[PDB]
Short mmCIF file of all heavy atoms in Angstrom, two decimals:
data_model
loop_
_atom_site.label_atom_id
_atom_site.label_comp_id
_atom_site.label_asym_id
_atom_site.label_seq_id
_atom_site.Cartn_x
_atom_site.Cartn_y
_atom_site.Cartn_z
N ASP D 83 89.27 53.95 89.49
CA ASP D 83 88.93 55.35 89.51
C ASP D 83 89.73 56.16 88.52
O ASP D 83 89.69 57.39 88.59
CB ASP D 83 89.12 55.92 90.89
CG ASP D 83 90.52 55.85 91.35
OD1 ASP D 83 91.35 55.13 90.79
OD2 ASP D 83 90.82 56.57 92.30
N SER D 84 90.47 55.53 87.64
CA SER D 84 91.39 56.24 86.80
C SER D 84 90.74 56.91 85.63
O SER D 84 91.41 57.66 84.92
CB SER D 84 92.43 55.28 86.31
OG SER D 84 91.81 54.19 85.72
N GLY D 85 89.47 56.67 85.39
CA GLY D 85 88.81 57.26 84.27
C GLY D 85 89.08 56.55 83.00
O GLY D 85 88.86 57.10 81.93
N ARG D 86 89.61 55.34 83.11
CA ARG D 86 89.89 54.52 81.95
C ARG D 86 89.61 53.08 82.31
O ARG D 86 89.49 52.73 83.48
CB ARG D 86 91.33 54.68 81.48
CG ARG D 86 92.26 55.34 82.48
CD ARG D 86 93.68 55.33 81.97
NE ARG D 86 93.91 56.37 80.97
CZ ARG D 86 94.87 57.28 81.04
NH1 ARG D 86 95.71 57.27 82.07
NH2 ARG D 86 95.00 58.19 80.09
N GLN D 104 93.96 49.93 77.07
CA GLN D 104 93.71 51.01 77.99
C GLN D 104 92.92 52.07 77.27
O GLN D 104 93.48 52.78 76.45
CB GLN D 104 95.01 51.56 78.47
CG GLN D 104 94.91 52.73 79.31
CD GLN D 104 96.22 53.13 79.79
OE1 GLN D 104 97.18 52.42 79.61
NE2 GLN D 104 96.32 54.31 80.35
N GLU D 105 91.66 52.22 77.58
CA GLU D 105 90.85 53.16 76.84
C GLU D 105 90.25 54.18 77.77
O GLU D 105 89.65 53.82 78.77
CB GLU D 105 89.75 52.46 76.09
CG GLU D 105 90.32 51.62 75.05
CD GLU D 105 90.94 52.42 73.95
OE1 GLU D 105 90.29 53.33 73.41
OE2 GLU D 105 92.12 52.20 73.67
N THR D 106 90.35 55.44 77.40
CA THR D 106 90.10 56.55 78.29
C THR D 106 88.75 57.16 77.98
O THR D 106 88.48 57.51 76.84
CB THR D 106 91.17 57.61 78.13
OG1 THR D 106 92.44 57.03 78.38
CG2 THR D 106 90.97 58.65 79.09
N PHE D 107 87.94 57.34 78.99
CA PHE D 107 86.66 57.93 78.79
C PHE D 107 86.30 59.06 79.71
O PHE D 107 85.31 59.72 79.46
CB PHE D 107 85.58 56.86 78.89
CG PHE D 107 85.70 55.99 80.07
CD1 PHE D 107 85.20 56.36 81.26
CD2 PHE D 107 86.30 54.77 79.97
CE1 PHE D 107 85.33 55.57 82.31
CE2 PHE D 107 86.40 53.99 81.04
CZ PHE D 107 85.92 54.39 82.20
N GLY D 108 87.05 59.32 80.76
CA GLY D 108 86.50 60.29 81.69
C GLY D 108 87.58 60.84 82.57
O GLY D 108 88.75 60.53 82.43
N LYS D 109 87.16 61.69 83.48
CA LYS D 109 88.08 62.23 84.45
C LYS D 109 88.36 61.21 85.55
O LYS D 109 87.69 60.20 85.65
CB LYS D 109 87.53 63.52 85.00
CG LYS D 109 87.56 64.59 83.98
CD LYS D 109 87.15 65.89 84.53
CE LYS D 109 87.22 66.96 83.53
NZ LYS D 109 88.61 67.22 83.29
N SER D 110 89.41 61.44 86.32
CA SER D 110 89.77 60.48 87.34
C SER D 110 89.16 60.80 88.69
O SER D 110 88.54 61.84 88.89
CB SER D 110 91.28 60.36 87.43
OG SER D 110 91.86 61.60 87.64
N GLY D 111 89.32 59.88 89.63
CA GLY D 111 88.65 59.92 90.91
C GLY D 111 87.40 59.06 90.92
O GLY D 111 87.02 58.49 89.92
N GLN F 13 82.18 61.58 72.55
CA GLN F 13 82.98 60.54 73.16
C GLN F 13 84.05 60.08 72.20
O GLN F 13 83.74 59.51 71.16
CB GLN F 13 82.07 59.41 73.56
CG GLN F 13 82.69 58.33 74.35
CD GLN F 13 83.26 58.82 75.61
OE1 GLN F 13 84.45 58.74 75.81
NE2 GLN F 13 82.44 59.39 76.45
N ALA F 14 85.30 60.32 72.53
CA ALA F 14 86.39 60.05 71.63
C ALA F 14 86.60 58.55 71.45
O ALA F 14 86.21 57.75 72.28
CB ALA F 14 87.66 60.67 72.16
N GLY F 15 87.23 58.18 70.36
CA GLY F 15 87.26 56.79 69.96
C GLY F 15 88.64 56.29 69.70
O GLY F 15 89.55 56.68 70.41
N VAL F 16 88.83 55.39 68.75
CA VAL F 16 90.17 54.94 68.42
C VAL F 16 90.83 55.70 67.29
O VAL F 16 91.93 55.34 66.89
CB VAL F 16 90.22 53.46 68.05
CG1 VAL F 16 89.97 52.67 69.24
CG2 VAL F 16 89.18 53.17 67.08
N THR F 40 100.48 63.61 75.66
CA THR F 40 99.61 62.51 75.21
C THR F 40 99.03 62.67 73.82
O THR F 40 98.85 63.77 73.32
CB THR F 40 98.44 62.28 76.20
OG1 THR F 40 97.79 63.51 76.47
CG2 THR F 40 98.95 61.68 77.50
N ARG F 43 92.83 61.65 70.50
CA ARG F 43 91.88 60.73 69.90
C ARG F 43 90.66 61.52 69.49
O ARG F 43 90.24 62.39 70.23
CB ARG F 43 91.43 59.68 70.86
CG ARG F 43 92.48 58.87 71.45
CD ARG F 43 92.93 57.87 70.51
NE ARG F 43 93.93 57.02 71.11
CZ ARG F 43 93.66 55.91 71.77
NH1 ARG F 43 92.42 55.51 71.91
NH2 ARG F 43 94.63 55.20 72.28
N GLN F 77 96.18 69.09 84.20
CA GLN F 77 94.87 69.60 84.49
C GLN F 77 93.75 68.72 83.98
O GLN F 77 92.61 69.08 84.19
CB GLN F 77 94.71 70.95 83.87
CG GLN F 77 95.52 71.97 84.49
CD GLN F 77 95.56 73.18 83.68
OE1 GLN F 77 95.06 73.19 82.60
NE2 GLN F 77 96.17 74.20 84.17
N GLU F 78 94.05 67.59 83.35
CA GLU F 78 93.09 66.68 82.74
C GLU F 78 92.17 67.37 81.77
O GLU F 78 90.98 67.15 81.77
CB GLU F 78 92.29 65.93 83.78
CG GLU F 78 93.10 64.85 84.35
CD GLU F 78 92.34 63.96 85.27
OE1 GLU F 78 91.20 64.30 85.62
OE2 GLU F 78 92.88 62.92 85.64
N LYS F 79 92.74 68.22 80.95
CA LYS F 79 92.01 68.78 79.84
C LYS F 79 91.93 67.79 78.71
O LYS F 79 91.17 68.01 77.78
CB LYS F 79 92.69 70.02 79.35
CG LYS F 79 92.99 71.04 80.34
CD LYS F 79 91.80 71.76 80.67
CE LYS F 79 92.11 73.05 81.35
NZ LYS F 79 92.78 73.97 80.42
N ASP F 80 92.69 66.73 78.76
CA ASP F 80 92.69 65.73 77.73
C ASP F 80 91.53 64.77 77.83
O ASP F 80 91.51 63.80 77.09
CB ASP F 80 93.96 64.91 77.78
CG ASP F 80 94.20 64.26 79.10
OD1 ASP F 80 93.61 64.67 80.10
OD2 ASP F 80 94.95 63.29 79.15
N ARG F 81 90.63 64.99 78.75
CA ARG F 81 89.56 64.08 79.07
C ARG F 81 88.22 64.66 78.78
O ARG F 81 87.22 64.10 79.20
CB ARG F 81 89.58 63.71 80.53
CG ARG F 81 90.84 63.22 81.07
CD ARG F 81 91.20 62.00 80.47
NE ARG F 81 92.34 61.41 81.13
CZ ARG F 81 92.24 60.55 82.12
NH1 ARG F 81 91.07 60.20 82.54
NH2 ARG F 81 93.30 60.03 82.68
N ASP F 82 88.16 65.81 78.13
CA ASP F 82 86.88 66.45 77.93
C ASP F 82 86.14 65.93 76.70
O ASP F 82 84.94 66.11 76.62
CB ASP F 82 87.04 67.95 77.81
CG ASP F 82 87.49 68.61 79.06
OD1 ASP F 82 87.18 68.13 80.14
OD2 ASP F 82 88.15 69.67 78.99
#
Side-chain angles (χ1 to χ4, degrees):
Chain D
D83 61 345
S84 53
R86 15 175 78 126
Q104 175 176 351
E105 294 291 309
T106 302
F107 48 84
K109 290 186 179 289
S110 55
Chain F
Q13 187 59 243
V16 290
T40 50
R43 303 282 183 90
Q77 291 167 354
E78 283 187 350
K79 308 283 197 67
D80 57 342
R81 308 296 188 92
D82 293 330

